[PDB]
Structure formats: C-alpha cells, structure tokens
Design an enzyme around this catalytic site. Structure first.
Site, short mmCIF file in Angstrom:
data_model
loop_
_atom_site.label_atom_id
_atom_site.label_comp_id
_atom_site.label_asym_id
_atom_site.label_seq_id
_atom_site.Cartn_x
_atom_site.Cartn_y
_atom_site.Cartn_z
N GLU A 61 30.36 27.90 51.51
CA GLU A 61 29.60 29.14 51.49
C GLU A 61 29.34 29.56 50.05
O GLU A 61 28.21 29.88 49.70
CB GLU A 61 30.36 30.26 52.20
N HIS A 62 30.38 29.55 49.23
CA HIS A 62 30.21 29.96 47.83
C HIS A 62 29.28 29.09 46.98
O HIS A 62 29.09 29.36 45.80
CB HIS A 62 31.57 30.05 47.12
N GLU A 116 39.24 35.36 44.14
CA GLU A 116 38.70 36.17 45.21
C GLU A 116 39.70 36.22 46.37
O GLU A 116 39.78 37.19 47.11
CB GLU A 116 37.40 35.52 45.68
#
Ligand code: HEM
Ligand code: HEM
Lengths: 406, 54, 442, 100, 49, 195, 54
Positions: C57-58, C134
């Site tokens: 996703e990142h 994160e």
C-alpha cells in the site's frame, strides 16, 4: 423525474430568510443558522457563547430536556450544534415524515430556551472537559492564541470558554446573549429534502424576537501580536498571519487561489520530516492569511524561515500563469467535492442565505474564481510580505524564532 | 448503585467475604482447614443442639 | 420516503470477458469517485508473507513504470483529483475522486497502479523505515492495539489473528520480490471490482475499463477464485497490563455469522439498542442505551461502542469500553448485563427505535460519492451484488422483539467470549467470572 | 357552609410547627422528590431554611419553644419549595410515563 | 509494538480434541458444554439426594 | 572557574495580557536599560525617586502606581507597575505614563533631584540595619566586584551625578522600545501600540 | 494513623458506635429504650445462664 427543483428562498417580513431544496433524499436535514458567536462577547460574559453551545439539550417551554433528547431519539433523529467565532448553526437530521416530528424540538431549542439556574449550574462543569478533549489537538490551541495576537477587540475572543470563567457564566447572560443575537433579522430556516412551503409553514411559529439587528460586534481592530507557549511537546506548531481577506470582499478569491498557488511550494522546500500549509480564514469584517507549520523541534527554525521565504519570493513574481490555472481548477474541485455530503453542502446553502440572502450558482461561483487570476496572486503575496504580521506557537520552541527575526 | 450486591449493608458483607474477596492464586491445600474448621463448628452446634434436646 | 427509496436509481453492474466486475451509480454530481476494491487482505498472507499487502500500500502511489513518482503525483495533483486507499484483513481498495469529466483518466491511473507499481528497490527501502515508524505510532493508540489483541486471541492460531500491518521483523526484511509476489498473486480481475458513483454513465466506464484492464485468462485457475481456510474462534482472554496508563481498555465478543448470513441484520439491530456513549453527549436521559444512561449516572466509562465487525465466513459481535482504573468492573458488569437483557427480555418499544436508528445510519451510510462507491465496491465483493436501501429497509424493517431475542440469544447466551484488555486493569475480574456473566439467572 | 379556609387556618395553628418558627415546607418529609426539590432551591432560601430547621432542633433539644411574637402567622407562611417540588413531581411522572 | 505479539499455543497442549483450527469451534462445543454441565447437573443431583 | 555562562540577554518588545477578571488590573511597562555596575545606573535610582510622587500625585480614584527598576548583570529594566481599579486602569496607565514622558521633557527642578538623591542615601542606609539585609550587601559586592564601596563613596557616587542625567534617563525611556505586561480584567486597559 | 482508636479493626468498630457516632441533638427520652432493651438482654442472658446452672 430529473431531480431538479430550484432551491426556493423567501425572506419573511421579519428578515428571516427561508431557503430549501427538495433533492429527494430518503433522509433530510433542517437547520437554523444565526449570526451569533463569541465575536460578540465582552471582558465579561465571555464563554457564554460556548456554554450556550452546550445547553442545546436543556429544558425549553415546549419540551423538557428529557422529552427532547428521547423525543429526537425515538425517531432516529440527530440534534447538534456547529459554532464559529461569528455564527452558530443548529442542525438536526432524520427522515420521511419524521422531520415534522423532529422540528418541534429544533423550534423550541432555538427560540424557547428557558435556561433554568439549576440545569446550567449543573451543566457548566462540562466546559472543563468539552474544552479539554478539543485541546488534545495542538492545532486548536495555537489557533485560539492566533486570533488572540491577531486582534485586540472582538473576534480576538476565545472559541472555547476561558478557564477562569468556567463556573461563573449566569443563567441570565445566557438569556441576554440569546435575546440580543437570536433575532429574525440575523437568522435563516434552511433545509434539504423538504417541501419549501412546508418549511415555511414552520418559520411562522418560529417567531419570538423581531429584534432585527439586536447587538453588534465591534469592528475588529488589528494587532501585531505574538504569544509563545513553552511546553516541550517535542514538535512545534507555528502559525504566521497578516491582516487580510473578508468574506464577500473581491480581494478574497485571490488568496483562495494563492492558498493553492502556495503549498507544494512551501512543502516542496524544506529539510527533514515535517508538515507545512498555507493558512486562510475569511471573516465578516476581516480575515487572515499565512501558514501553519508542524515541524520537528530543533528543525522548526529552518522549517519556518523556509515556508516564509517561499511566501516571500512568491510575491516577487515566482508564479507561472500555469500554477494559477492548476490552482484555479483545484478550488473548483474542493468546492464541488466539499458539497457532496449533504451536511457540508447544507452548510453552503445556509452560509449564503444568511450573509447575502441569495445563491451564487456553481456556474458563476466558478465564473468568479475564474473571473480573476495572476494579476492578483503575485500581488496577494506582496500584501503578506509587506504588511505587519502576528505569529503564534506551541511546543519546545527554544530553536524557534520570533517575528522580529522574521 | 448498579450491582445491588455491593451496595446492600448485608450482602456487601457477604460479597466481600465469600465473593470478590481477593485471595492469592497459589494458595495451597493446607488453607482448606479454616473453611473446614468453620463448617466443623456449624455441624457440632447443629448435632449438639439437636442432641441436647433429648 | 418509501418513494424516495423507490425512486433511487439502480446500480449498474457487468463483468468483463476478463473477470473484473464493473459497477456504478449515476447521479448528476459534477464530481464523483471511482476506484478498485480487491479481494485481498492480511488474512491472505503467510507467517513470512504478512505485511506485504501493507508494505505494498505504501508504494502503490509512489509511481509506476509507465510514469515515475514525480509524474504520477504531479499528474493527479494537477487535475485536482484525490487518490486514497486502505487494506483490512479481507478487503483492500484504492480510490480516486475527481470531476466525472475524468472517468477515463482516473480509470487509467487506477489500472496503471494495480498493475505496474514501480517497486523501486530504492523507494521500498525508504517506506520500510517509514512503516516501522508509522507502526510505532499506531502503537500508542491503545484503542487499536486492543482490537488487534482481540482478534489475536479471538482467532488465535489462524490467518485472521495476524494484524493488518504485520510484525516488525517482516517489515524489516520483506524483499522487493515478496511485494511483487504478493501483487501478482492477489490483484486479479476476478477478485477485483471497479466501482463508481457520480455524473458518470456506465458505458463510458465499462469501455474505459474494458480498454485499460486488458487482462487475459488462459488456464482455469486464473478464472477461478480460491476460498480461504476457515478460522477457529476461541473463547479466551489476553491481558496486556500496565498501571502506567491513564485508563484501561476492554473488549469482549462472541463469534459472528459472516456477511452472507441474514441475521446480521437482526443482530445489527440489537447493537443499535445498546448503542454507544461518549462524555460529550448531553444525556443522563438518553433514550434506552441504559448502558449509556447507567454509564452516566454511575460514571462507568469514558465511552463505549457496540460493533458487529464481520468477515467472509466469520466475524466478531461484541463491545468495547474505555474506563478509569476504578470503574472497570461495574462497567463490565452493567454492560454484560445488557446483552443478557438484550436477548432475554427485549421489548417492541426498544426494537422499534433500534430499527429507526439503523435506517438513519443505513442511509447516511451513503452520504456522498466516495462512500457510495465504497458500498458498491464492498457489497459486490462480499455479498455478490448490491443491496439497495430499498432492500436493507425491508430486511431490517421486519425485525420484531422476539426476533432480536431469538438471535442475540442464539449468538450470545452461554457462549465462551473473547476478551482483551490493555492498561490498568487490576480490577477486571477473572475469565470465569466474565464467563458466567454470559448466562442470566433467569 | 364552613370555609376550608377557616379549617386550614384551624389546622395550621393546631399543628403547631410554627411555635418552633418553621414554615410548613420546613416540615415535609424528605423523600426522593423533596430531595431533588430542595437541591434546586436558590441559595438564599437554602441557608434560610437550614438555619430555621436548626433553630427548631435546638428549641426542641431544650424542650422550649419560641415566644408568641415570633410565631409565624398562617397568612405569612411562604411556600418556598412547593413550586419546585411540583415540577419535580410532574417532570418525573412524564418519565414514569414515557418509559412505558 | 504490539503487532509483534502472538498468543502461545494451547493446541493439543490443553485444547480438547475437538479444537484444532480450520474447523468451526462452534459445531463442537454445544457438545463440550453439554458434558461439563452434565457433570455439574449430576452433582447437584447426587447432592440433593 | 567560570563553568557555564548565561547567553547575553537579547531584548524584545513584548506584550502579554492575562485575562482573568480579578476586579483590578496590575499593569507594568518597561524599557531596556540599566545594568549593575554601569554608570548609567545611579541615574534611574535617582529618577526612581525623582518619579513616584509625580505619577502618584497625578490620577483619578483609589489606586496605586510606582516607578519600576531592576538592574541586572548584562541588562536591566525601568518603567512602573500600576495596581488600579478595573475600568479606571486606562486612565491610570496613560497618566503614570504621561508623567514619565513629560518628566524627560524637562519637568525636574534641581530641587526634586536633591530630595531624591537624599532619599536613596536613606533607603540604602536604612535597608542595611537588619543584618540579613545588610549581609546581602556585603555579599552581593564581594561576588560581583570583589571589593567594598564604603558608605562614604557609595554616597560620593550617588551624589557624584544628578539633573544633567535624570531629565535624560526619562528620555531614554520615552524614546526606546517598550514592553508591557498585565493581569486582571483588562477590557478597559490599553496595549503598548496605544501607548 | 494518630488516634490509634480510629485505626484498629476492633476499636474502630466501637469508636464508631458508642463514640464519634453522629446522633441528633434533640433526641427525646423515648430513644432511651433501645439502650435499655440491649442491656435488658445482657441481663437476662446473664441471670439466665447463672440460673440454668442449677
Ligand atoms: C464446639 C462444638 C462442640 C464440641 C467440641 C462438643 C463436644 C462434645 C463432646 C466431646 C461430647 C461427648 C460425646 C460422648 O459422649 O462420647 C459432647 C457431648 C454433648 N454435647 Fe457437645 N460439643 C459441642 C457442641 C455442643 C453444643 C453446642 C450442644 C448443644 C447445644 C452440645 C450438646 C452436647 C450434649 C447434650 C452432649 C451429651 C450427649 C452425648 O454425649 O452423646 N454439644 N459434645
Ligand atoms: C431473652 C432473655 C430471656 C427471657 C425473655 C427469659 C424469660 C424467662 C421466663 C419467662 C422464665 C420463667 C420464670 C418463672 O418461672 O416465673 C425463664 C426461666 C428460665 N430461663 Fe429464661 N429467659 C431468657 C433467657 C434465659 C437464658 C439465655 C437462660 C440461660 C441460658 C435462661 C434460662 C432459664 C431457666 C433455667 C429458667 C428456669 C428457672 C426459672 O424459671 O426460675 N433464660 N426465662
């Protein structure tokens, strides 16, 4: 059929503009906008606006605090109040004919509020927390102090009741505050998913204060303030502004376009993990422009000067007639997008039906954003750089500069 | 109060001595004698009373 | 109202010779939002694969081979379009929101991502450390760790038990390869859905998709969709204690039925009855939701939420409260009492509202374009087609009291729950106790 | 033929709770309603009543009453709580009703 | 980070033979509670006597 | 030896207002100046007295006003704090201010200076009777200088100057940049930008 | 604690029931019977016990 039924606006003899729009949604929402707010408070009576914002559910003359809360709930309704330094909107959603049933409470809440000395004396401690949670966002704390340093009189008043005044607001100050601001000349009975006539048949009962203008917030005088909040949170929130803008003022759209003309610029211009944006609030008789920068501590200095230099040189002609097109077209989007969700959309139909009393169509609202460009953006920035500035900040700060160091 | 078992002047006495009462987890079987001793007493007093009646 | 529902336009759907399902809802709105929703989550990962989908996703946005980072970003920003997305345990998605004047452009952008992510060996290594960070931020959000721990123990030893982001070890070491390996294994047309809502007209969409989604299936595998290994629920607890925190978090739950199942409506209606609280409410007079009332009268908690989180063939029906070190017990006591009450002696006066409150949600569930798209995306992917408000209506417009009981009790009564609790939880009674708090001394 | 007004005055002076110097309302038994009721009472009155009630307990403690002059006269007895106590009771019956 | 935490294995270790993943725990436990309660049901029963 | 070292105190034209409605405002205004050991010092001490009766004897309603003065190592402060009734704060500040102002514009008779000059002599000599306050004197110098100015010369120094300075000290005030502070209701109180 | 009369598990029971116990000031003489009733009991049980011994 085609889902089109021109939003009808009918300004009652009072001045109580009534606007509607039957979009045919399975669920509708009515809402009372008002030109009230903490912008009208004095060295005393402060916070009375805020507390007022919390009293939403206290007993009235047509329905009891009980009946109203359970009343709305039995239908699947939603009573709520969004307030700004200079405007309070009392909304309430539901569906089908359950709107009719909803209205009674909304009607009562805004015009028949009989704040009982106990109910409030027993409510006020809320402030302590409603305020406490909100302040868990550094962003809010700095903006509170921004305006503090931005002005000297009204509008520079807090949006959340100041500490010292908590258990001191009086049941009276609440009536008096209402009596002088919740007046037909400064209200509007907006609404969606409703038959305009039907929304009008209500405005009639909603008549308890012809008042007209009532009170009046003193013209906001500007100031070159600067307050720093030492607290070492590990990362600084710094915001810098310069008198400017004004809702309805032509000079407006300019910044909106500079608001976008700027950003990638300040952002794409820095060192290490951070965040920076262009700030912009357009008030009734005034406004603000500049930028807030969440940055790592020690690096705050670098991160502020930078974001600043960009705003600076931006004025010195660093804007290609390209950047302007891009921007101009981003607002068009953000506008059109931030109107899909009925509630945010309803906020639009109302804000205007209160300020002007009209309705600029998407066609012209664009025609207006398009109406201008470049020969302004470059200039808007200038006004910034030249004019006097007022800063605000939270965090460690030790490595952060003061406006006198730019 | 809610529980209505921790508010009542008498139940609160019981719910604090035979329920909700903090006892170590590793209690050995040797600790079973206080109990027994008590019930041992209830038993005597009973049988006795009933026996004294004759 | 009923008419308002009856007059709500139908949602066009059609699959390609590829396998992708293309659906949408034409409105009028000059704006719109389109995106693809994948039949992929962390559930699909391995002990060594786990985290890929997230690492992935990142990078999904940071550029494609057809058009590197600087560009992709520049091209989207430049058109005022918004690209955002997410990934759960069984459901991932990427969506864009523009002016329906760009269905074709958006559509192309989309495809170019779900098909050609640069996966720059140089970019990856960067996001790697971005996540690890994160991740350490997701951590102090005790509101989320708690749910993770819940799933962990609830579905211990199974694919579900794994968290959507994944272990630091995995993230510290996933290979440029593994990511590709994850992409080319799960991002296939049969499992993907291209949905939209706005001024867009179906055909222009279909074609546009049918044009940029030039996938071709040879064998039968490609064309078929693999069913996952069932996940075993387990009545158990997990306690992450630390009196060092300001307050405690608790979450208890029983196994849920799963999307397909109908009762998820009656069950969805019951939760509407206990609802939720939050110190910013104004209501010691809250209609029912005594849990909330009681919570206010006796100051039982900072807040709480009832939830029916579900998956393909299972789920979690429970509740979660945040409370002070000292009121943990009563809160749990009082709440757990409501479930019983819920399925043992409910009333019509209650369910009546319950329904209404749902219907109001049910509808605001579709407030805007982005959210609508979310339904089409999901609905198809999990249900099989789309459920029109007009339908949801009936489904949940015919739930009476006896129906709630019968069900709730069917899923709650004397079941071995799964609790989780981080923070200062010394006062939370043992399992056995919360366990026997699952049967009413009728 | 015989005024309830004539009667009420009879009973008032008959009861005698005035020889102690306290209002009628200073004697109502504190059940749940009266409790809420008193808590809504303005502070002026609360302290007024508080003292009265204590001045009465003290007389009673001494087995002595208040001099005739100081006896509150029927027609001057101030129903300081009844208004409140009333709303409390109808506020409640409203709820006792809705919950059905 | 909590993501770094798993629940140990009670598999076999303690779980009764009807409990090993990829098989619904629920189809097998109304049978599991049936036993236990039966044992208790019997004790109350024997005790009454 | 020296160890650490405080960074040279940079000056700033600050202004922070504390809203709290206590019913009476505490307002203080200052301007960079002074410095312990700096000749320019004694000047203010004498203006500190040359001023006072002036600001005090110059106002309306029940209040209080004085001349402020702190002399630090590498810097200092001068001005005045004014405890005044709320609504009247404005009047009370502008006033105390005007006096400080005109004071510079030559409103000081070589008389006022003698009076003052002789008040310090007293306050000094008096605030040294109580050993502890006296000990504070013997020490403060034995730390700063390393000497001991005798009462003889300490006076010789206060006397050493006058008038051709007091009038001037005030000027420095009026002209230089100022920084204010305040507590109380404030609503009727002004900001430095309003002087 | 200081008092050592309000800290001890047993005295605290007494100092909270026959001392430091909040009693109204205007209590009438009619309230003297609970007391009597209690001592009346101590007396019976005594004389009785002593009488049962024969
Ligand atoms: C503390 C518990 C008690 C103990 C330790 C205890 C112990 C005994 C003992 C050692 C005996 C002799 C049994 C024998 O003859 O071999 C006995 C007899 C007796 N006890 Fe108790 N006793 C207790 C309580 C009572 C009480 C409270 C009663 C009834 C009020 C009672 C009434 C009698 C009577 C009547 C006998 C005579 C009958 C008999 O010995 O079979 N006992 N007890
Ligand atoms: C609650 C307190 C008591 C009451 C109300 C009470 C009352 C009486 C009564 C009415 C009598 C009859 C007296 C007569 O013959 O005219 C009596 C006799 C007797 N009581 Fe009690 N009694 C009490 C406690 C006790 C206790 C606890 C004992 C000793 C353990 C006891 C042992 C006896 C005996 C042995 C007699 C027979 C001797 C006699 O009557 O003179 N009493 N009691």
């Amino acid at each position: 059929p085609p889902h089109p039924q021109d939003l009808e606006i009918t300004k009652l003899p009072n001045g109580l503009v009534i606007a509607s729009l039957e979009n045919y949604s399975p669920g509708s929402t009515i809402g009372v906008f008002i030109k009230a707010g903490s912008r009208y408070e004095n060295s005393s009576n402060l916070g009375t606006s805020h507390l007022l914002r919390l009293a939403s559910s206290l007993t009235t003359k047509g329905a009891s605090s009980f009946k109203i809360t359970r009343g709305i709930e039995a239908v699947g309704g939603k009573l709520s109040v969004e307030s700004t330094r200079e405007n309070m909107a009392y909304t309430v959603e539901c569906l089908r004919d359950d709107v009719e049933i909803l209205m009674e409470f909304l009607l009562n809440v805004t015009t028949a509020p009989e704040f009982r000395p106990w109910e409030v004396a027993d409510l006020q401690p809320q402030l302590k927390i409603d305020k406490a949670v909100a302040f868990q966002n550094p962003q809010t704390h700095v903006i509170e102090n921004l305006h503090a340093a931005a002005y000297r009189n009204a509008l520079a008043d807090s949006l959340y009741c100041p500490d010292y005044r908590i258990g001191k607001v009086t049941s009276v100050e609440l009536h008096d505050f209402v009596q002088n601001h919740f007046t037909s000349a400064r209200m509007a009975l907006v609404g969606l998913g409703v038959s305009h006539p039907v929304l009008k048949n209500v405005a009639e009962q909603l008549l308890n204060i012809r008042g007209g203008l009532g009170l009046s917030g003193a013209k906001a005088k500007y100031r070159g303030g600067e307050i720093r909040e030492q607290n070492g949170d590990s990362l600084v929130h710094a915001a810098i502004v310069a008198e400017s803008a004004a809702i309805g003022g032509a000079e407006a759209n300019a910044f909106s376009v500079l608001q976008h003309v700027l950003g990638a610029n300040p952002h794409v211009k820095r060192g290490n993990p951070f965040d920076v944006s262009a700030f912009n609030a357009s008030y009734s008789d005034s406004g603000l422009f500049g930028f807030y920068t969440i940055s790592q501590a020690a690096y705050a200095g670098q991160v502020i000067k930078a974001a600043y230099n960009q705003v600076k040189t931006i004025a010195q002609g660093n804007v290609s007639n390209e950047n302007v097109q891009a921007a101009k077209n981003k607002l068009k989007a953000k506008y059109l997008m931030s109107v899909e969700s009925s509630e945010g959309f309803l906020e639009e139909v109302g804000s205007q039906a209160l300020a002007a009393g009209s309705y600029n169509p998407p066609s012209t609202v664009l025609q207006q954003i398009d109406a201008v460009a470049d020969a302004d953006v470059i200039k808007a920035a200038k006004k910034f750089v030249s004019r006097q500035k007022s800063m605000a900040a939270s965090g460690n700060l030790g490595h952060t500069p003061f406006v006198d160091e730019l | 109060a809610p529980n209505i078992r921790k508010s009542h002047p008498l139940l609160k006495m019981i719910n604090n001595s035979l329920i909700d009462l903090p006892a170590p987890s590793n209690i050995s079987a040797w600790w079973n004698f206080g109990s027994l001793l008590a019930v041992c007493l209830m038993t005597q007093i009973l049988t006795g009373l009933l026996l004294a009646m004759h | 109202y009923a008419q308002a529902l009856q007059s709500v336009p139908e949602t066009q759907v059609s699959q390609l010779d590829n396998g992708v399902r293309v659906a949408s809802e034409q409105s009028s709105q000059p704006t719109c939002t389109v995106g693809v929703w994948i039949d992929a989550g962390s559930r699909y990962e391995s002990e060594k694969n786990n985290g890929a989908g997230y690492f992935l996703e990142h990078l999904a946005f940071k550029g494609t081979k057809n058009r590197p980072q600087n560009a992709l970003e520049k091209e989207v920003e430049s058109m005022g379009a918004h690209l955002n997305a997410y990934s759960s345990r069984e459901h991932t998605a990427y969506y864009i929101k523009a002016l329906s004047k760009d269905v074709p452009k958006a559509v192309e952008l989309l495809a170019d991502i779900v098909q050609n992510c640069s996966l720059e060996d140089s970019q990856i290594e960067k996001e790697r450390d971005v996540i690890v960070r994160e991740l350490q931020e997701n951590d102090t959000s005790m509101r989320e760790v708690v749910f993770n721990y819940l799933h962990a123990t609830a579905f211990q030893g199974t694919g579900l038990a794994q968290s959507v982001e994944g272990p630091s070890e995995n993230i510290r070491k996933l290979s440029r390869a593994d990511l590709t390996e994850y992409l080319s294994t799960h991002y296939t047309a049969p499992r993907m859905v291209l949905a939209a809502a706005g001024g867009v007209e179906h055909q222009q969409l279909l074609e546009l998709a049918q044009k940029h989604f030039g996938g071709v299936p040879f064998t039968y595998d490609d064309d078929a969709v693999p069913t996952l290994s069932k996940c075993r629920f387990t009545g158990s607890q997990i306690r992450h204690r630390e009196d060092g925190l300001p307050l405690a978090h608790v979450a208890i739950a029983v196994e849920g039925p799963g999307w397909a199942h109908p009762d998820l409506v009656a069950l969805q209606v019951a939760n509407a009855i206990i609802g939720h609280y939050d110190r910013t409410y104004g209501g010691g007079l809250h209609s029912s939701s005594p849990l909330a009332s009681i919570a206010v009268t006796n100051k039982l908690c900072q807040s709480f939420q009832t939830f029916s989180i579900c998956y393909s063939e299972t789920g979690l029906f429970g509740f979660y409260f945040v409370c002070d070190r000292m009121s943990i017990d009563d809160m749990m006591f009082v709440l757990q009492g409501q479930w019983m009450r819920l399925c043992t002696s409910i009333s019509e006066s209650e369910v009546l509202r319950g329904k209404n409150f749902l219907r109001n949600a049910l509808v605001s569930h579709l407030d805007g374009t982005t959210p609508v798209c979310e339904d089409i995306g999901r609905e198809l992917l999990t249900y099989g087609r789309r459920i029109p408000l007009e339908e949801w209506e009936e489904r949940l417009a015919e739930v009476d009291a006896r129906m709630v009981r019968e069900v709730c009790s069917k899923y709650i009564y004397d079941q071995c729950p799964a609790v989780a609790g981080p923070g200062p939880i010394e006062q939370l009674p043992d399992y056995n106790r919360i366990r026997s708090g699952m049967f009413w001394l009728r | 033929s015989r005024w309830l007004e004539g009667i009420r005055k009879w009973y008032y002076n008959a009861a005698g709770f005035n020889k102690y110097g306290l209002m009628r309302d200073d004697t109502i038994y504190e059940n749940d309603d009266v409790k809420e009721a008193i808590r809504r009472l303005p502070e002026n009155l609360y302290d007024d009543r508080m003292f009265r009630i204590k001045r009465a307990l003290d007389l009673n403690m001494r087995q002595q009453i208040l001099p005739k002059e100081q006896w509150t006269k029927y027609e001057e007895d101030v129903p300081y709580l009844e208004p409140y106590l009333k709303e409390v009771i109808r506020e409640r019956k409203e709820r006792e009703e809705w919950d059905k | 980070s909590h993501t770094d935490i798993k629940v140990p294995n009670f598999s076999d270790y303690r779980r009764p033979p009807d409990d090993y993943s990829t098989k619904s725990s629920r189809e097998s436990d109304p049978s599991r509670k049936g036993f236990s309660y039966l044992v208790t049901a019997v004790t109350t029963l024997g005790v009454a006597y």
